[PDB]
Symmetry: C2
Subunit: 104 residues, 2 copies
Amino acid sequence: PNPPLPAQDPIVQHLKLTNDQITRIKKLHQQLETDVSQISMKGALIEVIKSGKWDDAAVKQQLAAFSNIEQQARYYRVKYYFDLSKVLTPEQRQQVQQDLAQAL
Amino acid sequence: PNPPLPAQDPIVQHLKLTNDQITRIKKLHQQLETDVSQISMALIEVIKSGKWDDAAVKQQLAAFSNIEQQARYYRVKYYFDLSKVLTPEQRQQVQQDLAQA
Ligand code: NA
Ligand code: NA
Ligand code: NA
Ligand code: NA
Ligand code: NA
């Protein structure tokens, strides 16, 4: 669950940010990318489909591994929008908060 | 995730399924939706508050992940069960589409 680049992000592109705001959020986004790339991501599901034999333990395990990774990624995504909103005016913040809610 | 009905699902729509195959896979799809609906089911506040709440963020994220784990389990189970009514050629195509996803 990655936030798009600010230039591509629907949540921020319609905010009418100043150049100073743009620079700060770009820095936050690079740092988001840096952090997520550091999350350890160490064919399982396809084999059980291919074998025709259900392997309950292997499925639960692979899915727990993937959920654990995604969870961590989502932690940084949440922080990213939290940090981003610090550089906003109250109006902009309310727009961001509303946009995030609509995404649910 | 959740998988669409067979006619709208990129993984199975190009398989050239028979009416008998479609009827069965749709019953599986119906059971999948039922099962997922039976899964027992914060972040906005931190934006509004401006105060980071680390424990609350992590809690919400753990609860959501536990749910998505369960939903993905049924999604995998769905394609496993689905493939039982397919021909060996169809079955191979489904595995290839899933890996790509
Ligand atoms: Na606009
Ligand atoms: Na870097
Ligand atoms: Na997950
Ligand atoms: Na179909
Ligand atoms: Na997750």
